[PDB]
């Protein structure tokens, strides 16, 4: 359902052989800053006439090897031709280069072979329906048929608004203009109305065989300079405001593709969210490619493809089609802001709530305070299932770790029925179906602390029944507690928790106020306590997060 | 206890009259990008010889008025002279410009008066112990005594490592060097060992009345070019790695001041945290001024002064000495990451946990989804008191709003005693002392849901007793619920909550699993429900957050 | 000397004539230092430009786009804000304009630097 299928880059700079799936809206990010920039340049060379005329240098070839040929192919999908207007744009120019047998697909390729004597390898653009017999894109002079289809707008991080406005002023009443024109000449008559015009001529005439020297603008009219005025960081957003209005009117007849590199540069965090809303929520930017290091620039992300360039020197690329389902729509904004910062990390530990974050932040601080520097990240997920977070992180090649409590949820409208919520979420990551809800018989005289302890006994009983299902969880880096985190914490530092709280049952007291008591616990936690919790088998997720 | 007291900027560019307190480590941020840049330039003009020799242009004067004089004064504190080594650095150069009566203070001023005929206003640097009779800083030629005290290192956002390395190579064995030197000459003898050297001379000699042409490096030795090699974004951190080692050895005899502008540019989020740890935790950067738009660059902030430039055109500056107390040290990293993003907002709503964030994000989405674009922010605080967050936001001129539940906490080691935790935190913001803990008599047969309902009756009773104390909370934008959020939510949409949950007591069912049930609630919440919750008097904090 | 100037800078003013020079750029340096009832009519007429320029579809649509993006966008025209004197570049009635730059230097330096020795 997207015109842009995938792009292939062969032997171009650090790209040995890289295949990346695509969509209308694409966002690229990762550690390799060189790979992200070369990715945008590889798209410009294929589609931007100004950057393509310069040809390939020796450095652009992969590993500076001129024998290997540079090849950049863009695969397109024309299946939605019946209801896509921009698809008909491409068809009208391609004409007979398509075949009816493969009418759904169309290829746009860039081939380059290097000449030693000419010290210069030219760029030959081919297209066609079949990848085997691509034909040269027809052209006459400095323009070809491809330049009539696609117009590439590259938004530099740093831009002067007055300079770009001078480019758009020309194309963007008459009886009124005539009065302004005659009045413009009225300026020059009053300016001359005098001692300098006559003395510079007497000096010029003796020097060289009328020197009036009027004033600019009045010669060419008021339209020559019409720079804007509002009523550094603020004017950057007005340049985007010009781009939206300009490109639609100027390039309505062709497909416009935006290449936005690092737009968060010299931009406030609040404006980054404003730009993110305009990129995804608004239909103003139909097709763009975005390179960003800013998590706040993805707060409003939806219906986009996320491309992650790996930190390795091989320049491996992992792409994910990020789409928020309608069921998650009521918590979409909360979910995106938490996941946006996790895309840039290397290992993400899925925790439930803030009480786990308060504990883990203190424990990690004593054991390994540089865990975020090396790519670790604590992502808290509350109320929702793990599938949306795991699918996005898995496709992007990000190591995901899950630590959740074994919980039971009472079904509404019926008493005595409890859903196996803790197991179902871990089973959902493995693709298995939700387990049947169970009914446990608790007497009416058993309430409060006595009631909770009996429910814990069912959790331990349920945990033992699915002993093999837990075995599959550990292979998938899923860590399901027997009862909950507080009981696993008691197993690691029971002597410390009893001394810290002086209460004979520290687990019961910790769960009274989970946030406050966890803060009270971490304040009195010893350094050996943090190492004991870290080294304990029940907390293997902390060892997997640091990556030892 | 800090050498840098405050700085005064008068009639310099957009700074009409601005007074900013300072410390050794300073971070500046805000909407006004022009004010932050002019703030760093105002410091360079006072202390950087290279930027000071160019003098003041007409544009540098405030509102382009040359009548008003530009004045930049830096107030210093020399009280810690007995134990501060860098203080003795300044004393050794100032010599007799200090008086013993005001020995604790020293002024460094920049005065500029404009000449119409000379079209140029020079920079006159004065210093002295008394602000009334400042004396010209002694100098001879292009250097003065102040250039011997302070060395300003300005770190540009974009820097080439090889170029800065060429500046530091000179100042950073012999029998080994002698073998490398003779071997270097061995290159040239083997290079000549020939057809080009004789033919270009035959052409040159006929053209003009020996043309051997050897090879660079071999003439000046191997030390001329020694560029580094490791075994774009990665090399930026190595440039900082050079700066730490270079500046300490090169400028050990003088006070080095770093001016770092927008270092998050072209830097990964993980490296920003690495740089933040080096700025605050490490003692490598004793004195610096930091301009940043990145919240991740303040994850490790501590013992620094936060300067916030207001969004207004008057360029108002609010400064806060941010310091984390020892009591908050066990949750310092968790607290900083939440507060770092709140410094850049304009209105911050302090909520307790994520269940409040899940609800507020959905409600705000329907009512005002652009609330973060206009400066709103939801900051969740769990387990800790509000004083640390409110003091930082209040000093920076950021509107702070607090919404918390009226809670009771059981004291450890004793039953029947409950602390008025909900009221104490709101009283702590007003400066009042903690209230005396109360004891409520609950029978042993009353447990579970019946026990919670009796405790709610005490909360309503406690709420009515302190009816006037709640009145002072509303003036301070403190919103204390009578019982909790769930009961206030029932008051706003009771009909909707009963229909959504089908349970006769939706408040009791919502509190069973606060996270999951809140997600279940917001999914079925109507648009009119969000407007009813927003318009209700119990949720006036949402109206104060958007700023209507 | 005091600051960036010394007594020698008050005696001698050095004019360095580069082989390649743009006349319009050097003229912008000398325009400031080189009647009133006439200037007042030119000034009011300069404001008469801006009133007739706005007299309209772009000023309202860019604001609707800006206001939704960020919490009036009229955008007039340069020169009319600072007056006619901001840009007054010359016009005669590459090699020829080089001699006119010397023609400016002779007249400029004598009036501007009459009080000091010009080299």
Author numbering:
A (entry chain A), B (entry chain A): 0 to 171, 181 to 201, 206 to 221, 225 to 246, 259 to 575
C (entry chain A): 138 to 171, 181 to 201, 206 to 221, 225 to 246, 259 to 284
Tell me what the authors wrote about this structure, in their words.
Gabija is one of the most prevalent anti-phage defence systems, occurring in more than 15% of all sequenced bacterial and archaeal genomes, but the molecular basis of how Gabija defends cells from viral infection remains poorly understood. Gabija protein A (GajA) is a DNA endonuclease that tetramerizes to form the core of the anti-phage defence complex. Two sets of Gabija protein B (GajB) dimers dock at opposite sides of the complex and create a 4:4 GajA–GajB assembly (hereafter, GajAB) that is essential for phage resistance in vivo.
GajA is a class 2 OLD nuclease, with the Toprim domain containing a complete active site composed of DxD after β3T (D432 and D434), an invariant glutamate after β2T (E379) and an invariant glycine between α1T and β1T (G409). Comparisons with UvrD and Rep show that GajB protomers in the GajAB complex exhibit a partial rotation of the 2B domain relative to 2A–1A–1B, consistent with a partially active conformation that is poised to interact with phage DNA. First, the GajA N-terminal ATPase domain contains an insertion between β7ABC and β8ABC that consists of four α-helices (α1–α4D) that zip up against a partnering GajA protomer to form a hydrophobic interface along the α2D helix. Notably, the GajAB structure shows that the GajB helicase 1A subdomain, which includes the DEXQD-box active site, is positioned adjacent to the GajA ATPase domain, suggesting that GajB ATP hydrolysis and DNA-unwinding activity might regulate the activation of the GajA ATPase domain.
